Amino acid sequence: IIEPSLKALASKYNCDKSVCRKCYARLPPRATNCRKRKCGHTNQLRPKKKLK
Amino acid sequence: AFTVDQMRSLMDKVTNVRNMSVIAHVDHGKSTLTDSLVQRAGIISAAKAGEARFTDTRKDEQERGITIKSTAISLYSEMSDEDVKEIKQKTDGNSFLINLIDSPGHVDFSSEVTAALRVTDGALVVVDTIEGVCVQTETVLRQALGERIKPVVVINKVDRALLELQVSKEDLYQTFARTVESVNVIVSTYADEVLGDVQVYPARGTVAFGSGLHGWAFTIRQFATRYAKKFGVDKAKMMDRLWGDSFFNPKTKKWTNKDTDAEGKPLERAFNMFILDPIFRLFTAIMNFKKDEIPVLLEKLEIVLKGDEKDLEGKALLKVVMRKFLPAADALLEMIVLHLPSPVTAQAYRAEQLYEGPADDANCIAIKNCDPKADLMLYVSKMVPTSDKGRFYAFGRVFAGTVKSGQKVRIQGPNYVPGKKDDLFIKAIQRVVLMMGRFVEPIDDCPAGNIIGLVGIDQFLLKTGTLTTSETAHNMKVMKFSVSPVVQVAVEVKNANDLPKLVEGLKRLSKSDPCVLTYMSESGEHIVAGTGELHLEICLQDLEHDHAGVPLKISPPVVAYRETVESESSQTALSKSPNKHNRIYLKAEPIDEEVSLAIENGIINPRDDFKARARIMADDYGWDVTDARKIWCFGPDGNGPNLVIDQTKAVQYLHEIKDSVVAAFQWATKEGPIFGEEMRSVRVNILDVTLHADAIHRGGGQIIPTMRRATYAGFLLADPKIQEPVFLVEIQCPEQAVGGIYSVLNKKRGQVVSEEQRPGTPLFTVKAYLPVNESFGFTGELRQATGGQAFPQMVFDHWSTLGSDPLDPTSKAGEIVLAARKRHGMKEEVPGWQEYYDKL
Amino acid sequence: REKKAEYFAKLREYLEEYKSLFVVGVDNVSSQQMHEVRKELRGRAVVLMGKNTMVRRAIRGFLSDLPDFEKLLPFVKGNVGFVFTNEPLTEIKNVIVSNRVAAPARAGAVAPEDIWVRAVNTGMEPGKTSFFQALGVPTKIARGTIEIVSDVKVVDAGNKVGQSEASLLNLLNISPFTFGLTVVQVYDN
Amino acid sequence: KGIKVTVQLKIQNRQAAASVVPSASSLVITALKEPPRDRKKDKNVKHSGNIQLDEIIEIARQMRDKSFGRTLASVTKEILGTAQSVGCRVDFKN
RNA sequence: UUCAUCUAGACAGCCGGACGGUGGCCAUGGAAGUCGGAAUCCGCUAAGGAGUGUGUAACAACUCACCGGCCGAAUGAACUA
Numbered sequence A: 001i002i003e004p005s006l007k008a009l010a011s012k013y014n015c016d017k018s019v020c021r022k023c024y025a026r027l028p029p030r031a032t033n034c035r036k037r038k039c040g041h042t043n044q045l046r047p048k049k050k051l052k
Numbered sequence B: 001a002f003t004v005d006q007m008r009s010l011m012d013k014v015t016n017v018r019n020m021s022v023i024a025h026v027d028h029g030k031s032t033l034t035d036s037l038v039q040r041a042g043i044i045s046a047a048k049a050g051e052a053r054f055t056d057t058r059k060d061e062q063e064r065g066i067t068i069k070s071t072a073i074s075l076y077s078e079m080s081d082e083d084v085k086e087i088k089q090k091t092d093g094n095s096f097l098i099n100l101i102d103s104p105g106h107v108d109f110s111s112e113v114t115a116a117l118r119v120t121d122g123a124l125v126v127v128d129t130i131e132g133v134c135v136q137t138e139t140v141l142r143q144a145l146g147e148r149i150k151p152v153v154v155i156n157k158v159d160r161a162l163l164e165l166q167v168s169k170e171d172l173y174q175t176f177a178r179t180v181e182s183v184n185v186i187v188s189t190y191a192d193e194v195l196g197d198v199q200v201y202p203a204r205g206t207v208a209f210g211s212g213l214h215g216w217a218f219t220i221r222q223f224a225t226r227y228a229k230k231f232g233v234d235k236a237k238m239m240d241r242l243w244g245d246s247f248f249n250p251k252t253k254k255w256t257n258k259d260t261d262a263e264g265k266p267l268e269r270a271f272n273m274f275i276l277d278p279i280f281r282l283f284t285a286i287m288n289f290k291k292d293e294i295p296v297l298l299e300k301l302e303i304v305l306k307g308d309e310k311d312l313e314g315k316a317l318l319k320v321v322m323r324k325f326l327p328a329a330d331a332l333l334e335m336i337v338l339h340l341p342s343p344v345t346a347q348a349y350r351a352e353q354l355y356e357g358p359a360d361d362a363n364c365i366a367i368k369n370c371d372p373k374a375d376l377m378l379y380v381s382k383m384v385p386t387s388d389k390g391r392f393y394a395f396g397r398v399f400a401g402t403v404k405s406g407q408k409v410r411i412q413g414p415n416y417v418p419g420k421k422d423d424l425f426i427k428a429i430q431r432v433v434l435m436m437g438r439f440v441e442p443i444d445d446c447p448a449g450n451i452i453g454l455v456g457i458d459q460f461l462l463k464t465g466t467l468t469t470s471e472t473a474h475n476m477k478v479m480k481f482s483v484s485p486v487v488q489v490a491v492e493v494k495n496a497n498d499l500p501k502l503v504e505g506l507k508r509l510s511k512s513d514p515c516v517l518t519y520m521s522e523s524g525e526h527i528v529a530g531t532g533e534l535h536l537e538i539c540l541q542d543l544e545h546d547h548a549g550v551p552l553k554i555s556p557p558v559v560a561y562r563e564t565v566e567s568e569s570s571q572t573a574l575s576k577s578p579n580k581h582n583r584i585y586l587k588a589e590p591i592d593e594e595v596s597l598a599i600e601n602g603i604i605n606p607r608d609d610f611k612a613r614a615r616i617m618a619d620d621y622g623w624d625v626t627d628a629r630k631i632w633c634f635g636p637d638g639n640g641p642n643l644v645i646d647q648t649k650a651v652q653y654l655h656e657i658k659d660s661v662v663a664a665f666q667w668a669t670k671e672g673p674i675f676g677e678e679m680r681s682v683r684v685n686i687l688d689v690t691l692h693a694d695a696i697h698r699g700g701g702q703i704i705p706t707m708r709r710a711t712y713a714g715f716l717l718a719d720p721k722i723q724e725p726v727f728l729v730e731i732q733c734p735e736q737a738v739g740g741i742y743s744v745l746n747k748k749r750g751q752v753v754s755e756e757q758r759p760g761t762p763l764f765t766v767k768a769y770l771p772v773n774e775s776f777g778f779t780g781e782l783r784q785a786t787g788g789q790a791f792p793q794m795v796f797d798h799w800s801t802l803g804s805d806p807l808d809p810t811s812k813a814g815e816i817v818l819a820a821r822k823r824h825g826m827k828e829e830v831p832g833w834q835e836y837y838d839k840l
Numbered sequence C: 001r002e003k004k005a006e007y008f009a010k011l012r013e014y015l016e017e018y019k020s021l022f023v024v025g026v027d028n029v030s031s032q033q034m035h036e037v038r039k040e041l042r043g044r045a046v047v048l049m050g051k052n053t054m055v056r057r058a059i060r061g062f063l064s065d066l067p068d069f070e071k072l073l074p075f076v077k078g079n080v081g082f083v084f085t086n087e088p089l090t091e092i093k094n095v096i097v098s099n100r101v102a103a104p105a106r107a108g109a110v111a112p113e114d115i116w117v118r119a120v121n122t123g124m125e126p127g128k129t130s131f132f133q134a135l136g137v138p139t140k141i142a143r144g145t146i147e148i149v150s151d152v153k154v155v156d157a158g159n160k161v162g163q164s165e166a167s168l169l170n171l172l173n174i175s176p177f178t179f180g181l182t183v184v185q186v187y188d189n
Numbered sequence D: 001k002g003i004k005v006t007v008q009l010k011i012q013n014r015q016a017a018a019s020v021v022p023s024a025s026s027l028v029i030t031a032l033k034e035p036p037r038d039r040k041k042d043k044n045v046k047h048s049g050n051i052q053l054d055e056i057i058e059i060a061r062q063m064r065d066k067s068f069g070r071t072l073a074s075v076t077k078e079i080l081g082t083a084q085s086v087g088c089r090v091d092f093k094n
Numbered sequence E: 001u002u003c004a005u006c007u008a009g010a011c012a013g014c015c016g017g018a019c020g021g022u023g024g025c026c027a028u029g030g031a032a033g034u035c036g037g038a039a040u041c042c043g044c045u046a047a048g049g050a051g052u053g054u055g056u057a058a059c060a061a062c063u064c065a066c067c068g069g070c071c072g073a074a075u076g077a078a079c080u081a
């Protein structure tokens, strides 16, 4: 365990970002095109699942 | 121990006797601190052999680092009598035996701590530094605290924080701070109103700590006392005002309460400059492999280290120095003789919980005074075995009288009052032997409050026992103990011959340990119960040998499917026999499901006179008054779920056909057509019959067909549905993490019943109907959804109703009649409607 | 804009004839029991704490029956709001500042000022007593009551309200998150 | 007494215990509607009723949890009817 | 292309409320602002949905819809090739 106010520092910057649906890159918490070119800027995103 | 064999002079000196129970988490540190406690004894392999682990006693303990059960400990400890009158007790002797028992963690096992906790005289729980309280040190300590008992916490493993965790002067004091405070707040969850004064205070010498690997401990006394030989007087003053205040010491010796120096700088720790600056200086100095600071620092504290023991750097220079400073023998056992009661003091509030009668008879003064001259009863719960097949010791404790070898005492049972002649036994005892760790020592007599092994009496008690010799007294309690009746496993011998070794194997395994339970199926099969999974692993693994003598095989158990019809038996069915001899019309009226709970219990027992049950049917069920017309006798086995009809035409029939019609439909009312076995709340209505002959052209093998397709057919014509049992379980846990219970019941086809409060907020159990067909690992996934602290209880109550249409192989019921038909052995469920519906 | 036309007429009908004008810039508020001070203030003065028309609140005084309407055109900032009465305003100001009901912050939002915590009694069962490891206060149970051993700070200047240590701060019942009804400008006629 | 989980009004302070009702949301519906309002709602669902059964509803306005203040019974009668999805009590607004 | 919004201060951005009725009706052991069944509501209003989404097992703690302040203007969607 650590202090949860500092957990709001680390988990925001590695954990609670967004993810693509067709090639599984990590995406910022508002995006609409998976910026890696291979899936072709697809409009299919979702939240990365919750902590534990 | 050097008390060999002076261990009888100390047992009559009853003020000099104490005994405890160290219960904690699993990979936690119990079975090595006890090895320092008996490293004081001259029974371990001295110099050095630290990892003694005297709970070994067996294999599958040393290879795992684990504990199942453990015997006691004898010892005697030497000290000064100035160092002992801090107890209130008027004790005279200098030597003290600590006849030590204990019991492990393991939430699976944790009915076993009750058998060694309703018998002991003090609770000494063990807590890690870096972990704090774990989840079941507190639950397993508070099952039970309602005894009363004296919970003295003894934390340990400060070395793991001390070298790995890089602990500083403040953070480890915050570790003891939040650990000790967060563990003693929970002690007064159900502490009593006056004698619940067992709030752990450190400065009163209670919270001793150290390492099992480095093998040492101390509370604040023995670094206030050998420190109090210098630098002032006295022990109670500088030990009392300690722990927060603090002093200054760069220029002055003022003892304030604040945090600010006169120019503004923060002061210090009161703790780690007084009392543990040598542990930072010691091990932080040693673990950099310096050679300049350790002899001079050895001169800084208590000349000298001995002999050869200088040069051995590398974990021996580490390993021997605190052992030179202090043992855990003049530390922890010093705390044990200071603040822990004798049985003559602690037993006075002990057996009003344990004595079933009112405070009336000679035991209500001879237990309270714990007379050594009085009657000779005791109490026995756990049954430790020895290295034979098993002629297992009765772990007993006498509460009254000096018990004697070669003695004749009455024996009683679990739930028994001595009025009747059944199950009280009058035998004599073989031998009265004592035990330390893995060894034994025979004795002759003992006063009250002393646990002894008891030889040979084990044949005549089941998992618990009292054995009295003043036959007006009562039984001693069973308390309705704790966790885990709980789970079921089908068990079966191979190769079809060692059934006697199995049945003697488990009827002796039942007397082996009281935590497990065993019983028989609906079919008389061999299922064994259990407390969880790894318990059945650890003992039902070695039901292989030492318990039975033949290897076995394990299978999940077969749920008792039942059969039901409910609605109207759609068509008036007909049956023509394979000989052209008769026709059968019928229109079955399945009775309500009130006879499901109204066919067994004492409201009706059939084959009475034929008017009294007419009063019960007309006055209680809703039938007519002309039911005395209706019925004669039914099936199966007397106790069947039917009582027969008369919709036959009342002209002549059924007094020459009954003797092979009521002797015909036992199948099917003991073994049925759709799934295979019997049915309840059923009622066929034979409208028409035919016997176109006399009693020489009918008979046995001609008339025992007659229901050959009849109540088979019109049984199976309406809907019918197969039927299941659904348990009445309850699950107890506090409301930190109840959130998994309702959800996991929802994912396992369960039913919430209620929710209950209590004066506090622990143990908020929930009543839940939970069906048997998915009730197998339910305790296990309940542990995965809670994480430990939720203790199921499970019992049978009733027979519910299933409705997923078994006659068509589509749904859940079609699946279980399908695969359970494949293990039944016969093939498909019959389509029919030309079979069983002969169109006449 | 024709639904913004009923922001004209609801501002027209109050700015015709009456006595006072009193604007209040209320960014931070707690609406619930301050419009129970529209229920104790039921029919006293309907507030108009409305739209971005700070330019056209002073432009649209083209009637010039009271030509002092041009006051807030160089006030294109602040959340203005009109109340009015023909009564002495000195007595209502005693009660419309006493709307200092407060709640916890936004689970970790801003903080007004550093708060010192003494050892004062509350008197409940031991509830969150085993849940003081985030802040780390020495606090002891005695007589079935919660008593504080030593004084440990909670907040510090520069840092704000949190969620670990300040969730339990209103188990001690102070009022950080209100920002009550604050005076901006008062004038008669 | 109530089928909806009812809020009550009683403080626990030194012999003060009498279950009185605050005239809350589902609490005027128990009194004004038919005496089958505490009864006949175990299997039933009944979103019906349009008979003008009262015109003097305002004899609980000093009890009905002061919200709109200045008018006798204007605002409450279009609150209920929707908040009171049993009936509507008026031909005023639906 | 079509339908819209505004220098009468639009859009994004941060500061702010995010209610009283009323922990709305049934349902639900319980379903309290956010969980199933229909409907679908006024006062305060600057605002409030039977609430956008987390949240306890039912609560309490969080995010907006609406419109307040920021500063000075052009933006928003659906589409079409």
Ligand SMILES: CO[C@H]1[C@@H](O)[C@H](O)[C@H](OC[C@@]23C[C@@H]4[C@H](C)CC[C@H]4[C@@]4(C=O)C[C@@H]2C[C@H](C(C)C)[C@@]34C(=O)O)O[C@@H]1C
Pocket: B485, B486, B517, B519, B520, B521, B522, B529, B557, B558, B559, B560, B725, B772, B794, B795, B796, B797
């Ligand atoms: C240990 O305490 C209790 C509870 O654990 C529980 O009530 C358990 O239930 C076992 C069952 C008892 C039923 C009666 C004996 C007749 C039908 C039996 C069951 C059906 O197979 C219903 C429950 C569940 C078990 C299986 C086989 C389906 C039963 C069985 O033991 O066979 O019994 C023990 C004694």
Ligand SMILES: Nc1nc2c(ncn2[C@@H]2O[C@H](COP(=O)(O)OP(=O)(O)CP(=O)(O)O)[C@@H](O)[C@H]2O)c(=O)[nH]1
Pocket: B024, B025, B026, B027, B028, B029, B030, B031, B032, B033, B055, B065, B066, B067, B068, B104, B105, B157, B159, B160, B210, B211, B212, B213, B214, B215
């Ligand atoms: N570092 C360190 N490890 C210890 C200490 N005491 C025990 N261990 C570790 O624990 C294990 C030995 O088991 P031990 O902890 O003594 O007993 P236990 O955990 O109580 C066993 P049970 O709880 O089942 O009775 C080893 O892995 C050993 O390294 C200690 O003081 N320091």
Ligand SMILES: [Zn+2]
Pocket: A020, A023, A025, A033, A034, A035, A036, A037, A038, A039, A040, A041
């Ligand atoms: Zn991409």
